[PDB]
Amino acid sequence: EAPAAVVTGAAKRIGRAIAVKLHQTGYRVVIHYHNSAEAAVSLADELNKERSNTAVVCQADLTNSNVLPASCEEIINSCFRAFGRCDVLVNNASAFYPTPLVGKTVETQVAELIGTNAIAPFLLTMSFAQRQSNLSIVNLCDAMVDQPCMAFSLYNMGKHALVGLTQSAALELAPYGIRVNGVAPGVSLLPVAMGEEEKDKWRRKVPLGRREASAEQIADAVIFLVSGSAQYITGSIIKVDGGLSLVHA
Amino acid sequence: EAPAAVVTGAAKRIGRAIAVKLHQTGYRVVIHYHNSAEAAVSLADELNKERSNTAVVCQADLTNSNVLPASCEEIINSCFRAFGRCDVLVNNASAFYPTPLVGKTVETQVAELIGTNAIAPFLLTMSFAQRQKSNLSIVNLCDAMVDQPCMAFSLYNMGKHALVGLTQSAALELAPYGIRVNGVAPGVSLLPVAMGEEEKDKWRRKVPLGRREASAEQIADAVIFLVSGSAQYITGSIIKVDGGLSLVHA
Amino acid sequence: EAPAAVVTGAAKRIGRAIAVKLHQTGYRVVIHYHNSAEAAVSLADELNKERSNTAVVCQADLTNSNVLPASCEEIINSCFRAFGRCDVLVNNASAFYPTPLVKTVETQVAELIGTNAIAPFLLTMSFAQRQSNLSIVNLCDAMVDQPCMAFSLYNMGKHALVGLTQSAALELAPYGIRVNGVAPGVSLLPVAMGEEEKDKWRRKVPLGRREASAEQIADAVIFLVSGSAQYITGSIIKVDGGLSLVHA
Amino acid sequence: EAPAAVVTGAAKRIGRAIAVKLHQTGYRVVIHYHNSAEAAVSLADELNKERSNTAVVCQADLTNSNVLPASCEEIINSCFRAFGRCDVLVNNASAFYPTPLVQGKTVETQVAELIGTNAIAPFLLTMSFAQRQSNLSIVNLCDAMVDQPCMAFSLYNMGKHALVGLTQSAALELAPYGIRVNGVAPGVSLLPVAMGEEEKDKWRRKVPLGRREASAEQIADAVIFLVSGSAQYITGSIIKVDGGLSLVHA
Ligand SMILES: NC(=O)C1=CN([C@@H]2O[C@H](COP(=O)(O)OP(=O)(O)OC[C@H]3O[C@@H](n4cnc5c(N)ncnc54)[C@H](OP(=O)(O)O)[C@@H]3O)[C@@H](O)[C@H]2O)C=CC1
Ligand SMILES: NC(=O)C1=CN([C@@H]2O[C@H](COP(=O)(O)OP(=O)(O)OC[C@H]3O[C@@H](n4cnc5c(N)ncnc54)[C@H](OP(=O)(O)O)[C@@H]3O)[C@@H](O)[C@H]2O)C=CC1
Ligand SMILES: NC(=O)C1=CN([C@@H]2O[C@H](COP(=O)(O)OP(=O)(O)OC[C@H]3O[C@@H](n4cnc5c(N)ncnc54)[C@H](OP(=O)(O)O)[C@@H]3O)[C@@H](O)[C@H]2O)C=CC1
Ligand SMILES: NC(=O)C1=CN([C@@H]2O[C@H](COP(=O)(O)OP(=O)(O)OC[C@H]3O[C@@H](n4cnc5c(N)ncnc54)[C@H](OP(=O)(O)O)[C@@H]3O)[C@@H](O)[C@H]2O)C=CC1
Ligand SMILES: COc1ccc2c(c1)N1C(=NC(N)=NC1(C)C)N2
Ligand SMILES: COc1ccc2c(c1)N1C(=NC(N)=NC1(C)C)N2
Ligand SMILES: COc1ccc2c(c1)N1C(=NC(N)=NC1(C)C)N2
């Protein structure tokens, strides 16, 4: 049988490109989504049209709460229900917005930003490992976490925690043959709600080509990490940032 | 008048040594505690014998919940109510125990390890900065071994990495207000008193510099430096106080 | 027609695996050697038999000296001469031995800083000067921050190479030249070291209690040079099976 | 008696500030210099006038060459000759200039000066200080911006990265001897004498904490901390003193 992968937040943008690319490599895919039901189901349709019965969707809020462990278990369970196995987990879903230190409550900001970026990854990792060829997890990190955006403390804390998870799970799961690695974009597909001038400000900072990464360029590093060419790599985070993190103020 | 500092988890061990050294330096202190009321009050009584009206206690759970923000606001408020100002915040309180990937529920483990080590620090930092109305700083107790973690301590390790991110993010964001934000990262310091000496020795033997753990006071010394006038240009820095432990390969 | 790569210290071990894998991916290659002529020629023969006139050999000492500049120019030149282009430079060659704080010291600097850092820097200069998917790959070390006792100079050289990786990535990005690193933990162990000492290292590795093969190291090199890494520069990929995550 | 320190490149700027602060703390000092003979002697004159027979000068080129080991040995010997002991080594001297990759001095000279002053001389001086052997320590002057370097400064960047490696490797290997090895990493401190005010202000405006460069004294304060008994458990640590500069994205 073909191996199977879960990609969180896979209806759009980078998560979609990862799902597409995994599928093109031979994987059956679980397309996790939160709000993007139309685009989720649309992507599965496209993949299934190419090879029947190779894509399912699975809906879940990855906000932190007392029921997040059950939702994460359910995402993994979905892969086993549809495909009888789960070889690859891609932790891609992410909330991203400012939380200044000085209309959501602070408790909601914490639950969303830390839940999606860190807690849900951890719980999905636990469920993935409990339910267990070439098994591996890839976490979508952030190349700029040590030169953060102003007023993004909770997002930055989340992505730092995700680095911690990447290392800790790599150490602990290596005895089970499960590798755990990260891919750290710099600027890739820029937000929908961002203006053109602000987009171009960011592009101009990238040494390699003065432009953002394509979604596909990020996916390429994910593909490498899950491949048979990365069988001795665990606990590594690959920056895919065109040099951006090298540039001083 | 005299500056004031809040120290979380200050009843015992490292937090205690930090509160004492701040007080000896001339600070009035809030001693935050969770369970150790008797130790907290004993310390407050000792410090107040040294100088009257210079130390208060403040009880709070720092586990993540819907009431954590209000708790953190109250902790900061307690310093203002007692001393009329809050110059220094030391994020010291920390939960620490294994959370294997493969008798608390997992959601409890999350709330306690991420709440104490990361979220409560964030919410304390927010309340600290919001309430500012000379030499303001925050010091976060980090962990020098976070890139070489103990097996099965993922949630602990996640919380302490998050604390690094908070240190950096808040240093950048609070710099325009003149508030510095730094960390101190112990390697092996005070081990649990009930841990067998033969187990304590396994750790001590790994430390290059003197084959011994840091005392609480040695950790406090770095905190004192960071809050001092000798560190007025330092922000976003994390000082390892680890006797070279983090340099030793497997 | 086909792209061309220089690999330093390519006659044996990791550099040979890198050369072969590059060849099999369809590069023409320059096999650089210092002492290992026989091995270099043997490799070139094996490759040429596969695809005619696609591998050449190049001698140079990479010890630092007043002639290192010219040596490095020569290595790059020989690629332009054999193949009319030079698409990839792999800085693999390297010296390794203890230099206790408590060979003259200056020979040790020239070997340990020269081969590990200064020659990569001079080769990088000649590579860029003489300029598609152009990239440079430097062989770093995953254990730089938890170093072996009494290996100061070696560790200095490998830290310098990290610095070169970053600095050259920034400076050459304008020319579309990518600059990246691959950092082995324990791979092929030194021929010299005890078999008992070897197993002591194997046992520390989380992923499989074993060293990386040379080919696993090359696999990462191949990724970085490929079209699949066209946005990657200034990145160092550890290939260490988790070794650097293990505490004392 | 009083302890003694060697400070390299101590005639002016940050190195003088370190030698001055060490002297005020009660150290005897060797003022190493290369070209700045007048300024070095002037400083030793000031310090001797404060306390007689507490300061000497010592000339040496720290460019790499076959005699650099002897020059480094002689620097350390000068301290023992003058004061009968050597307790602290501060590796401060540094060459700094562009070395573009795509393109005065021959490249071989650039390598000698930039790698020699920033890394090889620190290594040889460390070797001599340890071999020649309380509170012994070495403090290396590093650079907070080594991971976000200036364009066209490969060789300088290489040398400062090697100096981090030295700090770590030496801390590990010398810990059994009770010698601590740490670093201080400025971001922008005293700007070059040659830089125009306009360009200086461009750098100043990037610093979060105050939009100004560090004073030489602020850099010295962190050095003083690392050598002090307040840092007795610290080895292998590099303290950034950069007002948050390294946290600022492009
Ligand atoms: N794009 C870039 O430049 C950079 C991206 N990255 C990282 O790469 C990854 C992919 O980036 P990108 O595609 O831009 O990400 P997006 O910002 O587009 O978010 C990805 C998906 O996350 C899902 N998500 C958000 N909140 C929740 C929630 N509460 N519960 C469940 N799912 C949720 C959304 O699902 P739905 O739409 O179904 O609601 C969304 O489509 C992320 O981890 C990001 O942090 C890092 C650095 C730079
Ligand atoms: N000791 C060491 O070797 C090392 C320590 N560190 C860090 O240094 C700091 C101090 O270390 P140490 O003194 O050993 O810490 P402890 O493990 O002794 O914990 C300090 C205090 O944290 C408080 N705390 C625990 N859980 C909670 C909670 N849910 N709510 C509120 N407070 C809570 C406790 O207060 P109470 O007693 O009142 O309940 C406790 O006394 C910590 O941040 C730790 O992670 C880092 C690396 C190593
Ligand atoms: N193997 C491992 O476990 C690890 C490897 N690495 C790095 O990986 C790379 C490859 O490692 P490995 O294959 O073990 O390396 P080796 O130690 O086998 O050296 C590789 C080649 O370097 C060449 N070389 C040595 N000194 C000189 C010199 N003065 N002038 C010119 N060439 C010279 C030699 O070529 P010749 O034979 O022609 O004389 C030699 O075959 C190195 O950069 C190394 O530091 C890093 C960490 C661990
Ligand atoms: N100032 C800043 O903004 C920053 C400084 N730093 C580091 O802090 C330290 C102090 O900086 P700063 O005071 O500006 O340093 P300077 O640039 O002023 O140089 C210090 C001394 O280095 C000596 N020196 C230079 N070349 C040689 C050589 N070949 N042999 C021997 N000595 C030599 C010179 O001594 P002489 O005059 O006697 O010839 C000079 O006075 C340095 O290590 C530097 O790299 C790091 C980042 C920023
Ligand atoms: C300012 O450019 C960035 C910079 C960093 C980014 C980022 C965008 N993203 C990040 N995560 C998520 N989830 N979405 C977006 C908003 C696209 N990280
Ligand atoms: C195994 O020795 C360590 C190693 C790391 C430690 C640690 C103890 N501690 C940590 N945090 C907290 N809160 N308490 C204790 C148990 C003292 N980190
Ligand atoms: C441009 O600001 C910097 C930034 C980094 C600097 C630096 C100056 N210096 C450095 N080293 C030496 N030796 N002198 C000077 C030129 C003052 N590092």
Automatic annotation (TrEMBL), chain D:
Entry-annotated residues carrying Cysteine sulfenic acid (-SOH): C58, C72, C150
Residues binding NADP(+): 12-14, 34-36, 61-63, 92, 94, 156, 160, 187, 189-190
Gene3D superfamilies assigned: NAD(P)-binding Rossmann-like Domain
Keyword Glycoprotein set for record: no
Alphabetic keyword roster: Nucleotide-binding, Oxidoreductase
Residues involved in NADPH binding: R13, I14, H34, N35, S36, D61, L62, T63, N92, S94, Y156, K160, S189, L190
Superkingdom of the organism of origin: Eukaryota
Pfam families: adh_short_C2
Active site: D143 (proton donor/acceptor), Y156 (proton donor/acceptor), Y156 (proton acceptor)
MF terms in GO: nucleotide binding; pteridine reductase activity
Binding-site positions, substrate: S137
CDD domains noted in UniProt: PR_SDR_c
Family membership noted in the UniProt record: Belongs to the short-chain dehydrogenases/reductases (SDR) family.
Family annotation (NCBIfam families): pter_reduc_Leis
Protein name: Pteridine reductase
Organism for this UniProt entry: Trypanosoma brucei brucei
Upper classification of the organism: Eukaryota, Discoba, Euglenozoa, Kinetoplastea, Metakinetoplastina
